[PDB]
């Protein structure tokens, strides 16, 4: 715990916690590749349980980075290609709007206006087929980006079809286990419930609700130690012994589309480093992050650029997560909190910390 790391982390996060009234928080800084952990406050206010390095938080949409890497791994295995039509893996998707919509489009929110959320009324598998068959794109494929669980969530579900594994089985055996993420879960097992923090929304203790494509879009729970290891793995994929997983990580950080100063990967989003902090801080606000934006194709995609700010925000009703890292500098951060507090505050704090250490 080098004093410089201690000081910048505490001087940044303490006021953040006060300003945002965050009940509990865990932070990991990866510095020169090694992790340093910090915790504050409560995983469960009522039961007076502190946040520890073993507390599980809901990652919300940081889960999309696992989905993107799992899909990358499936590509590397030759099970799927991003150029494949969606209908190759879901032949029942016969409606004509699907002609020309590829796995790439699903993975990268560019299918033409798939919505942020699958409707809550979608309860059954037949309900889900009906939803996608009936959905009408606003835009031609590959022209506009609209951040969407219904897009990358469907990508994740289809990416694992050739394996014959469930999404959860595939994620466990192909991503979590090889990376030794032994406290990372799509479904929190009873054995780990003592460590599962409550989220807090309007003062009420809450956990994520079941929904269609939840696992694939926002359903992972993890500890600060596993998330630090996730950052390490994404910083230095060549250290990964499993070849297709190493390659999948590289594929998820490739740059497929550009909008403004941001590049869309598979789950991960990237900017060139050094970044303008106003560009990423303001860019993280949901006023921007969730907007419909024209995209420019990167033809062909640019392989993972080491001088990148690579990051992802995540939320559920009760939790707010953020991960960012810079491969060139072997530097990264994870911020896990059990309140869904504004994205710009997350990015500002992460940038203040990483810039001071870089």
Q: How far is the CB of 328 from ligand 0ND (least distance, A)?
A: 17
Contacts 24+ apart (CB under 8 A), 324-329: 324/350, 324/351, 324/354, 325/30, 325/231, 325/234, 325/235, 326/273, 326/354, 326/358, 327/234, 327/235, 327/236, 328/273, 329/273, 329/358
Residue nearest to ligand 0ND (CB): 61
61 is in an annotated binding site: yes
Burial of 162 (0-12, 13-18, 19+ CB in 10 A): middle
Query: Which residue number, 85 or 317, has a Cβ lying nearer to ligand 0ND?
Result: 317
Query: Which residue number, 60 or 156, has a Cβ lying nearer to ligand 0ND?
Result: 60
The beta strands (E) that lie in the chain are given as: 24-31, 34-44, 49-50, 57-58, 144-145, 184-185, 199-201, 204-206, 221-222, 255-259, 262-264, 269-272, 293-294, 296-302, 308-316, 319-326, 331-337
282 is in an annotated binding site: no
CA 343, CA 267: separation in Å to the nearest integer?
Answer: 17
Q: Dihedral, CA atoms, 132, 137, 141, 144, nearest 10 degrees?
A: -120
- Where along the sequence are the contacts to ligand 0ND (CB under 6 A)? 60-61, 75, 82, 116-117, 149, 208-209, 218, 247, 250-251, 254, 300-301, 303, 314-317
Query: Which residue number, 61 or 163, has a Cβ lying nearer to ligand 0ND?
Result: 61
Specify whether 279 is catalytic: no
Query: Which residue number, 149 or 222, has a Cβ lying nearer to ligand 0ND?
Result: 149
CA 215, CA 208: separation in Å to the nearest integer?
Answer: 11
Catalytic residue among 61, 63, 163, 233: 61
322 is in an annotated binding site: no
149 is in an annotated binding site: yes
Q: How far is the CB of 263 from ligand 0ND (least distance, A)?
A: 11
117 is in an annotated binding site: yes
Query: Which residue number, 86 or 250, has a Cβ lying nearer to ligand 0ND?
Result: 250
350 is in an annotated binding site: no
Binding residues for a beta-lactam: 61, 117, 147, 149, 315, 340
What residues are labeled active site? Answer: 61
Residue positions in the annotated binding site? 61, 117, 147, 149, 315, 340
């Amino acid at each position: 715990a080098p004093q410089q790391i201690n000081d910048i982390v505490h001087r940044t996060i303490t006021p953040l916690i006060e300003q945002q009234k965050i009940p509990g928080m865990a932070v990991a800084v990866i510095y020169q590749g090694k992790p340093y952990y910090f915790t504050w406050g409560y995983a469960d206010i009522a039961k007076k349980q502190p946040v520890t390095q073993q507390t599980l938080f809901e990652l919300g949409s940081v889960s999309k980075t696992f989905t993107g890497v799992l899909g990358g791994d499936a590509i590397a295995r030759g099970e799927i290609k991003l150029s494949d039509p969606t209908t190759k893996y879901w032949p029942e998707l016969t409606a004509k709007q699907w002609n020309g919509i590829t796995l790439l489009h699903l993975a990268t929110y560019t299918a033409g206006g798939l919505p942020l959320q699958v409707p809550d009324e979608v309860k059954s598998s037949s309900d889900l087929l009906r939803f996608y068959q009936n959905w009408q794109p606003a835009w031609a494929p590959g022209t506009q980006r609209l951040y969407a669980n219904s897009s990358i969530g469907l990508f994740g579900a289809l990416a694992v079809k050739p394996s014959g594994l469930s999404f959860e089985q595939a994620m466990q055996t192909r991503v979590f286990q090889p990376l030794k993420l032994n406290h990372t879960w799509i479904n929190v097992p009873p054995a780990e419930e003592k460590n599962y923090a409550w989220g807090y929304r309007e003062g009420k203790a809450v956990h994520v609700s079941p929904g269609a494509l939840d696992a694939e879009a926002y359903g992972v729970k993890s500890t600060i130690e596993d998330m630090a290891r996730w950052v390490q793995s994404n910083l230095k994929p060549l250290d990964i012994n499993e070849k297709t997983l190493q390659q999948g990580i590289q594929l998820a950080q490739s740059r497929y589309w550009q909008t403004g100063d941001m590049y869309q990967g598979l789950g991960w989003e990237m900017l060139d480093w050094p970044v303008n902090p106003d560009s990423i801080i303001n860019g993280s606000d949901n006023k921007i992050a969730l907007a419909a934006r024209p995209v420019k194709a990167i033809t062909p995609p640019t392989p993972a650029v080491r001088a990148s700010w690579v990051h992802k925000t995540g939320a559920t009703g009760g939790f707010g997560s953020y991960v960012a890292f810079i491969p060139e500098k072997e530097l990264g951060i994870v911020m896990l909190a059990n309140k869904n507090y504004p994205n710009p505050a997350r990015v500002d704090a992460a940038w203040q910390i990483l810039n001071a250490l870089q």
